[PDB]
Coordinates of C-alpha atoms and ligand atoms in Angstrom, one line a residue:
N13 CA -90.8 29.3 37.9
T14 CA -92.6 26.2 36.3
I15 CA -94.4 24.9 33.2
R16 CA -97.2 22.6 33.0
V17 CA -96.6 19.5 30.7
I18 CA -98.5 16.0 30.0
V19 CA -96.5 12.9 30.3
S20 CA -97.3 9.6 28.5
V21 CA -95.8 6.8 30.5
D22 CA -95.2 3.5 30.9
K23 CA -97.2 2.6 34.1
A24 CA -94.8 -0.1 35.2
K25 CA -91.7 2.1 34.8
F26 CA -92.4 5.4 35.7
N27 CA -91.6 6.7 39.3
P28 CA -93.8 9.8 40.4
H29 CA -90.7 10.2 42.9
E30 CA -88.6 11.2 39.9
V31 CA -90.3 14.2 38.9
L32 CA -90.5 15.5 42.6
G33 CA -86.4 14.6 42.8
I34 CA -86.3 17.5 40.1
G35 CA -88.1 20.0 42.0
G36 CA -91.5 18.8 39.9
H37 CA -94.8 18.1 41.3
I38 CA -97.8 16.0 40.2
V39 CA -100.7 17.6 39.3
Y40 CA -103.3 15.4 37.7
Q41 CA -102.7 11.2 37.1
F42 CA -105.0 10.3 34.4
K43 CA -107.0 7.1 35.3
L44 CA -108.4 6.2 31.8
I45 CA -105.0 6.7 29.8
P46 CA -101.3 6.0 30.7
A47 CA -100.5 9.9 31.3
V48 CA -99.8 12.4 34.0
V49 CA -100.1 16.2 34.0
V50 CA -96.7 17.7 35.8
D51 CA -95.3 21.1 36.8
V52 CA -91.5 21.1 36.3
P53 CA -89.3 24.0 36.0
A54 CA -89.3 25.5 32.4
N55 CA -85.3 24.3 32.6
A56 CA -86.1 20.5 34.0
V57 CA -88.1 19.3 30.9
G58 CA -84.9 17.4 29.1
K59 CA -84.7 15.8 32.6
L60 CA -87.9 14.2 32.1
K61 CA -87.6 13.2 28.7
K62 CA -84.9 10.8 30.2
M63 CA -86.5 9.4 33.4
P64 CA -87.6 5.6 33.3
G65 CA -91.1 5.0 32.0
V66 CA -91.4 8.6 30.2
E67 CA -92.5 7.6 26.6
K68 CA -93.7 11.5 25.5
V69 CA -93.3 14.9 26.9
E70 CA -96.0 17.3 25.4
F71 CA -96.5 20.7 26.4
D72 CA -99.9 22.2 27.4
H73 CA -101.5 23.9 24.2
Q74 CA -104.6 26.2 24.6
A75 CA -108.1 25.9 23.1
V76 CA -110.8 28.7 23.1
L77 CA -114.5 29.2 22.7
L78 CA -116.1 29.7 19.5
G79 CA -119.0 31.9 20.4
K80 CA -119.4 35.7 20.4
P81 CA -122.5 37.9 21.3
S82 CA -124.1 38.9 18.2
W83 CA -124.6 42.4 18.9
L84 CA -122.0 42.8 22.3
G85 CA -125.1 42.0 24.5
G86 CA -125.1 41.3 28.1
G87 CA -128.3 39.5 28.3
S88 CA -131.7 40.5 28.3
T89 CA -135.3 39.3 29.6
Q90 CA -137.7 36.5 27.8
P91 CA -140.9 36.4 30.2
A92 CA -143.0 34.4 27.5
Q93 CA -141.3 31.3 26.0
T94 CA -139.9 31.7 22.3
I95 CA -138.6 28.9 19.9
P96 CA -135.2 29.9 18.3
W97 CA -135.0 29.5 14.7
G98 CA -132.7 27.2 15.0
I99 CA -134.3 25.0 16.7
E100 CA -136.8 24.4 14.1
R101 CA -134.5 24.4 11.3
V102 CA -133.0 21.2 13.2
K103 CA -137.0 19.9 12.8
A104 CA -136.7 19.3 16.7
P105 CA -140.3 20.1 17.9
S106 CA -141.9 17.5 16.1
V107 CA -139.9 14.8 17.7
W108 CA -141.0 15.8 21.5
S109 CA -143.8 13.8 21.1
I110 CA -141.6 10.8 20.9
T111 CA -138.9 12.0 23.5
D112 CA -137.6 15.1 24.6
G113 CA -134.6 13.3 26.0
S114 CA -135.9 12.8 29.4
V115 CA -135.0 9.0 29.6
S116 CA -132.8 8.4 32.5
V117 CA -130.1 6.6 31.1
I118 CA -128.9 9.6 28.8
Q119 CA -126.9 12.6 29.8
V120 CA -125.2 14.9 27.7
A121 CA -121.9 16.6 29.2
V122 CA -121.1 20.0 27.8
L123 CA -117.2 21.1 28.3
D124 CA -117.3 24.7 28.7
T125 CA -116.6 28.0 30.4
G126 CA -119.6 26.5 33.3
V127 CA -122.8 27.0 33.5
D128 CA -125.3 29.3 35.7
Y129 CA -127.0 26.3 37.6
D130 CA -130.0 28.5 39.3
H131 CA -131.2 29.6 35.6
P132 CA -135.0 28.7 36.1
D133 CA -134.9 27.8 32.5
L134 CA -131.8 25.0 32.7
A135 CA -131.5 24.4 36.7
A136 CA -134.0 21.3 36.3
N137 CA -131.8 19.8 33.6
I138 CA -128.4 20.2 35.4
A139 CA -127.7 16.7 36.8
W140 CA -124.1 17.4 37.5
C141 CA -122.1 20.2 37.7
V142 CA -118.1 20.1 37.9
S143 CA -115.1 22.0 37.1
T144 CA -111.6 20.6 35.9
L145 CA -109.8 24.3 35.7
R146 CA -106.0 24.0 36.7
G147 CA -105.7 20.2 36.5
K148 CA -108.1 19.6 39.8
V149 CA -111.6 18.0 39.7
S150 CA -113.9 20.3 41.8
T151 CA -117.5 19.6 42.5
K152 CA -118.1 22.7 44.4
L153 CA -120.9 24.9 42.9
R154 CA -118.8 28.3 43.2
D155 CA -116.0 26.8 40.7
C156 CA -118.5 25.1 38.5
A157 CA -120.5 28.3 38.0
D158 CA -120.2 30.3 34.6
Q159 CA -118.1 33.2 34.6
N160 CA -118.2 33.9 30.9
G161 CA -122.0 33.2 29.8
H162 CA -120.6 31.1 26.9
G163 CA -121.4 27.8 28.6
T164 CA -124.8 29.0 29.8
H165 CA -125.7 29.7 26.0
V166 CA -124.4 26.4 24.8
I167 CA -126.2 24.0 27.1
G168 CA -129.5 26.2 26.5
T169 CA -129.6 25.6 22.8
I170 CA -129.2 21.6 24.2
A171 CA -131.6 21.3 26.9
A172 CA -133.5 24.6 27.7
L173 CA -136.6 23.8 29.3
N174 CA -140.1 23.6 27.7
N175 CA -142.4 25.7 29.7
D176 CA -143.6 29.3 29.8
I177 CA -140.3 31.2 29.9
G178 CA -137.5 32.1 27.7
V179 CA -136.4 29.4 25.0
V180 CA -136.6 26.0 24.6
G181 CA -133.4 23.4 23.6
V182 CA -133.4 20.3 21.0
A183 CA -133.8 18.1 23.9
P184 CA -135.6 20.0 26.7
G185 CA -135.9 17.1 28.9
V186 CA -132.2 15.7 28.6
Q187 CA -129.8 15.7 31.6
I188 CA -126.8 17.8 31.6
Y189 CA -123.3 17.5 32.9
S190 CA -121.9 20.8 32.9
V191 CA -118.0 20.3 32.9
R192 CA -115.9 24.0 33.2
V193 CA -113.0 23.3 31.0
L194 CA -112.7 27.1 30.0
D195 CA -111.9 30.1 32.2
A196 CA -113.9 33.2 32.4
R197 CA -112.3 34.6 29.4
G198 CA -113.1 31.3 27.4
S199 CA -109.4 30.2 27.3
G200 CA -108.6 26.5 28.0
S201 CA -105.5 24.8 28.4
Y202 CA -105.9 21.1 26.5
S203 CA -104.8 19.4 29.7
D204 CA -107.9 20.7 31.4
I205 CA -109.8 19.9 28.7
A206 CA -108.5 16.1 28.7
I207 CA -109.5 15.7 32.2
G208 CA -112.9 17.2 31.4
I209 CA -113.1 14.6 29.0
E210 CA -112.3 11.8 31.8
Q211 CA -115.0 13.4 34.2
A212 CA -117.5 12.6 31.4
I213 CA -116.7 9.1 31.3
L214 CA -116.1 8.8 35.3
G215 CA -119.5 10.4 35.9
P216 CA -120.2 11.5 39.3
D217 CA -119.3 8.3 41.0
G218 CA -115.8 8.6 39.7
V219 CA -116.0 5.0 38.3
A220 CA -116.0 4.4 34.4
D221 CA -117.6 1.0 34.6
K222 CA -118.8 0.3 38.1
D223 CA -120.2 -2.8 37.4
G224 CA -117.5 -4.1 35.2
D225 CA -119.6 -5.5 32.5
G226 CA -117.7 -3.7 29.7
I227 CA -120.5 -1.4 29.2
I228 CA -120.2 2.6 29.9
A229 CA -122.4 4.3 27.7
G230 CA -125.8 3.4 27.4
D231 CA -125.7 1.3 30.8
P232 CA -128.4 2.4 33.1
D233 CA -126.2 1.1 36.1
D234 CA -123.3 3.9 35.3
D235 CA -123.6 7.3 35.3
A236 CA -121.5 8.1 32.6
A237 CA -122.3 10.8 29.7
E238 CA -123.4 9.3 26.0
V239 CA -122.5 12.8 24.5
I240 CA -119.7 15.0 25.1
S241 CA -120.1 18.3 23.3
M242 CA -117.2 20.6 22.6
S243 CA -118.0 24.2 21.5
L244 CA -114.1 25.0 21.5
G245 CA -110.8 24.5 19.6
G246 CA -107.3 24.5 18.9
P247 CA -104.7 24.3 16.4
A248 CA -102.8 22.0 18.4
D249 CA -102.9 17.9 18.0
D250 CA -101.7 16.2 21.0
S251 CA -101.2 12.3 21.6
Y252 CA -102.6 12.1 25.0
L253 CA -105.5 14.4 24.0
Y254 CA -106.4 12.1 21.2
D255 CA -105.9 9.1 23.5
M256 CA -108.8 10.5 25.8
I257 CA -110.8 10.9 22.7
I258 CA -110.3 7.5 21.9
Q259 CA -111.1 6.4 25.1
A260 CA -114.6 8.0 25.5
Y261 CA -115.3 7.4 21.8
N262 CA -114.5 3.5 22.8
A263 CA -117.1 4.0 25.4
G264 CA -119.5 4.5 23.0
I265 CA -119.6 8.3 23.6
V266 CA -120.7 10.5 20.9
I267 CA -118.2 13.4 20.5
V268 CA -119.2 16.7 18.8
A269 CA -117.0 19.5 18.2
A270 CA -117.2 23.4 16.8
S271 CA -115.5 23.4 13.4
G272 CA -113.9 26.6 14.1
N273 CA -114.4 30.4 13.1
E274 CA -111.3 31.4 11.3
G275 CA -112.8 30.2 7.6
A276 CA -110.0 27.8 7.4
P277 CA -109.3 24.9 5.0
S278 CA -110.2 22.3 7.7
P279 CA -111.7 21.8 11.0
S280 CA -109.7 22.7 14.4
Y281 CA -109.2 20.1 16.9
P282 CA -110.8 18.4 18.7
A283 CA -113.4 18.5 15.7
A284 CA -110.8 17.5 13.4
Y285 CA -110.2 14.1 14.8
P286 CA -112.2 11.2 12.9
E287 CA -113.9 10.0 16.1
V288 CA -115.4 13.7 16.4
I289 CA -118.4 15.1 14.8
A290 CA -116.9 18.4 13.2
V291 CA -120.1 20.9 13.0
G292 CA -119.9 23.7 10.5
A293 CA -122.3 26.9 11.1
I294 CA -125.5 28.1 8.8
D295 CA -127.3 31.2 9.0
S296 CA -131.1 31.8 8.6
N297 CA -131.1 31.7 4.9
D298 CA -129.2 28.2 4.7
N299 CA -125.9 29.6 3.4
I300 CA -122.8 28.6 5.2
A301 CA -121.4 31.1 7.5
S302 CA -117.8 32.7 6.1
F303 CA -116.2 32.3 9.2
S304 CA -117.2 28.4 9.5
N305 CA -114.0 26.1 9.3
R306 CA -114.1 24.0 5.9
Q307 CA -114.5 20.4 5.6
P308 CA -117.0 20.0 8.7
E309 CA -119.0 16.5 9.1
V310 CA -122.2 18.4 9.4
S311 CA -123.6 21.4 9.9
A312 CA -126.1 23.4 11.9
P313 CA -127.5 26.9 13.0
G314 CA -125.0 29.1 14.1
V315 CA -125.6 32.7 13.1
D316 CA -127.5 34.9 15.7
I317 CA -128.7 32.2 17.9
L318 CA -131.0 33.2 21.1
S319 CA -130.4 31.0 24.3
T320 CA -130.0 31.3 28.1
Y321 CA -127.4 33.7 29.5
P322 CA -126.0 34.2 32.9
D323 CA -128.1 35.9 35.7
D324 CA -131.4 34.2 34.5
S325 CA -131.0 36.2 31.3
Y326 CA -131.0 35.5 27.4
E327 CA -128.7 36.6 24.7
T328 CA -127.8 36.2 21.1
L329 CA -124.4 34.5 20.1
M330 CA -122.6 33.3 16.7
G331 CA -120.2 31.1 15.9
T332 CA -120.0 27.4 15.4
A333 CA -119.7 27.3 18.9
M334 CA -123.8 27.7 18.5
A335 CA -124.0 25.0 15.8
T336 CA -122.3 22.3 17.9
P337 CA -124.7 22.2 20.4
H338 CA -127.7 21.7 17.9
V339 CA -126.0 18.6 16.7
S340 CA -125.2 17.4 20.4
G341 CA -129.1 17.7 21.2
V342 CA -129.9 15.9 18.1
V343 CA -128.0 12.6 19.1
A344 CA -129.2 13.1 22.9
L345 CA -132.8 12.8 20.9
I346 CA -131.8 9.9 18.7
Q347 CA -130.1 7.6 21.7
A348 CA -133.0 8.8 23.8
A349 CA -135.6 7.7 21.6
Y350 CA -133.5 4.6 20.5
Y351 CA -133.1 3.4 24.2
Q352 CA -136.8 4.4 25.1
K353 CA -137.9 2.0 22.3
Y354 CA -134.8 -0.8 22.4
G355 CA -133.1 -1.4 25.7
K356 CA -130.0 0.2 24.4
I357 CA -128.5 3.0 22.5
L358 CA -126.8 3.0 18.7
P359 CA -123.2 2.5 18.2
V360 CA -121.2 5.5 17.4
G361 CA -120.2 4.9 13.7
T362 CA -117.5 7.0 11.7
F363 CA -117.4 9.9 9.2
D364 CA -118.0 7.8 5.9
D365 CA -120.9 6.3 7.8
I366 CA -124.0 6.1 5.8
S367 CA -126.2 3.6 7.3
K368 CA -129.1 3.7 9.6
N369 CA -127.4 1.3 12.2
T370 CA -125.3 4.0 13.6
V371 CA -125.5 7.3 15.1
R372 CA -123.4 9.2 12.6
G373 CA -124.8 7.2 9.7
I374 CA -128.2 8.1 10.8
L375 CA -126.7 12.3 11.1
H376 CA -125.6 11.9 7.4
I377 CA -128.3 10.1 5.2
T378 CA -131.0 12.2 6.9
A379 CA -129.0 15.6 6.9
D380 CA -130.7 18.4 4.3
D381 CA -127.9 18.0 1.4
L382 CA -127.4 21.7 0.5
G383 CA -124.8 23.1 -1.8
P384 CA -123.2 20.5 -4.1
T385 CA -124.8 17.1 -4.2
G386 CA -123.4 14.7 -1.6
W387 CA -120.7 15.9 1.2
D388 CA -119.3 19.1 0.3
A389 CA -116.5 21.2 2.1
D390 CA -119.2 23.9 3.2
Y391 CA -122.1 22.2 4.7
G392 CA -120.4 18.6 5.0
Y393 CA -123.2 16.1 5.0
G394 CA -125.8 18.8 5.2
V395 CA -128.0 20.4 7.9
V396 CA -129.0 18.2 11.0
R397 CA -132.6 17.1 11.3
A398 CA -133.7 15.8 14.3
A399 CA -137.3 14.7 12.9
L400 CA -136.0 12.4 10.3
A401 CA -133.1 11.2 12.4
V402 CA -135.4 9.6 15.0
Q403 CA -137.7 8.2 12.3
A404 CA -134.3 6.2 10.6
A405 CA -133.3 5.4 14.3
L406 CA -136.6 3.6 15.3
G407 CA -137.4 2.9 11.6
Ligands
CA519 CA1 -138.0 27.6 28.2
CA520 CA1 -119.5 6.4 36.6
CA521 CA1 -121.4 -0.8 32.8
CA522 CA1 -125.1 -2.9 33.2
CA523 CA1 -125.6 7.6 30.9
CA524 CA1 -124.1 18.8 -0.4

C-alpha cells in the first residue's frame, strides 16, 4: 500500500509535485533540515531516488522505550512526599537552596510516551504538551496525553513538584515540554522522533530564532528548550536524524539519551552520537546494571526508581530510561543556576571535555568516578552529582 520514508533533498531543485505524481504524498516538511517525510507505495521508492533534488532516501526505523515496571506494578498511592533514592544519590536536594530550576528561561523537553498533564505532582511544571505521532504535530491535550506511563515516570524523575505528596524531581521547579514521540506501547518511529526534536527547538511559537539574534537556547526572548531528554533507543543510524541532532546541538541545547538495556558493547542511538550524552544505569549499591549498554558518557540511578505514573499515581521502574532523566535534571540545575547568576547559559561541550567551562565538562569532572580510575566502559565518567556540578558552574 505505502511506506513512510525520509528524504534528504536540495530545496532549490526538489519538487514536491514530483512525489504526488507517483502516487505519493507529503507528510512533514522539516523546517530546520533539508528533508521531508513522505509516503510512497513500496514500489515507487526507486522512482524517488531518481527525482531531481533527491539526495538520500532513508527508511523509517524504530526506537523503543527503555524502562519497565520493576514488579509489573500499575501505579499506587503516595499520600506523603518521599525522596526517591536516586534523587539523593545524584546529590540534588542540597542544590534546591540555590535553584530548583524555576528560572523562567529554562525548559526541559522530554521526548517520550507523553505525559499525564493533570497529575497533581507534575501539572504545575508542564509548560507545553504536544505530540508528533504519525508525522503530524498536534497541540491537543487528547493527543499529548500519556497512554503508557513511561513518559509520566521519566518526567517525574526530572521535575516532580516538591510539596507534600508523592515524590520530588532533580529539578522540582523546572518547566517541562512533554513531546509525545512514542505510542501507547512505547514504540516510536525515527521520523516522529526527529520531528519531536525539531518541535523542542521551534517551541510553542513555532519559530526557532524569533528575534533573529543567533541565540536560541538560553535566550529569554525565545521559547526554545535548553535540554532534550530521550529515554529511548534504536540500532539504526540515519543521516537525517543525526542532522536534526546537530541542529539541536548547534542551538545550544544539551541532549541526553539512554544507553540501552541489552548489555551491548556500546550505546544505542541517539545516545551513540557524539553530540548526545549516553547515560548508563547503576543500582542502589553503586554497581552498574548488567543490562546497561556499555561505553556511556556518564551513569545515574536506573534500578527500582520510584516516580509519578498516570492517573495521579506512582510506580517503580527500571532501565537506562530511568537514569537519563536524572542527568537531564542535573543539567537543568546547572543551566538554571548559571543563568540565575550570569545572564546566560553554559555552552554544550563534547565527550572529551574535562573543564568547568562546559556543561558536559562539568558533568565529567564532578562525577563520582567509580570502577577503574577515570572514564571506563561501565560507569563512563562516573555518577552525576548535582551539588558538585553546580558549585563548579558558579565557581
Ligand atoms: Ca511531590
Ligand atoms: Ca520558538
Ligand atoms: Ca533568539
Ligand atoms: Ca534575544
Ligand atoms: Ca528556553
Ligand atoms: Ca571510573
